[PDB]
Amino acid sequence: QLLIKQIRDMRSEHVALQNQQKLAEKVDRKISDKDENIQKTRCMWNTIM
Amino acid sequence: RDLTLLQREERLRDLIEKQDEVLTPVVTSKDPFKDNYTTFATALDSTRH
Amino acid sequence: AEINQKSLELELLRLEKETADITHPLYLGQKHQALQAMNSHLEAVLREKRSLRQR
């Protein structure tokens, strides 16, 4: 009985999370430029300071 | 785990983009200013003694 | 399950540390102050342009 209850609860949780991932991937293609933007910003500050 | 990491990276990108927009004009005009100001200050300092 | 939770926490903290110089309010605040001091100084210099020129 315990195991039945636990599996049911987890299945419900898995569906909820799948709906949230589908909304987030429509935004991400452009990530290949992060480390480069951070270093660029850091460099600009260092130059000013 | 994947959802939580994506949310944090998005916040970081937003913050870097806002800073790049305002830092770029200041770094480009720096060297002419520093040189003009130093020459000015040295000239002014020679009149006080 | 417990290992997985702590592992996530660790990963998050590591990301925050690596980007603190450009993102954390503390460090950004210090940069603001330095910039305001110079602004004020330049304003003064521009206000006394005539006298400075004469000198």
Curated annotation (Swiss-Prot), chain B:
Record's subcellular location: Cytoplasm; Cytoplasm, Cytoskeleton, Microtubule organizing center, Centrosome; Cytoplasm, Cytoskeleton, Spindle; Cytoplasm, Cytoskeleton, Spindle pole
Signal peptide segment: none
Quaternary state and interactors: Component of the HAUS augmin-like complex. The complex interacts with the gamma-tubulin ring complex and this interaction is required for spindle assembly. Associates with microtubules. The interaction with microtubules is strong during mitosis, while it is weak or absent during interphase. It is unclear whether this interaction is direct or indirect.
Family: Belongs to the HAUS8 family.
Role of this protein: Contributes to mitotic spindle assembly, maintenance of centrosome integrity and completion of cytokinesis as part of the HAUS augmin-like complex.
Name of the protein in question: HAUS augmin-like complex subunit 8
Organism, scientific name: Xenopus laevis
Gene that this sequence comes from: haus8
Span within the parent record: 211 to 259 of 367
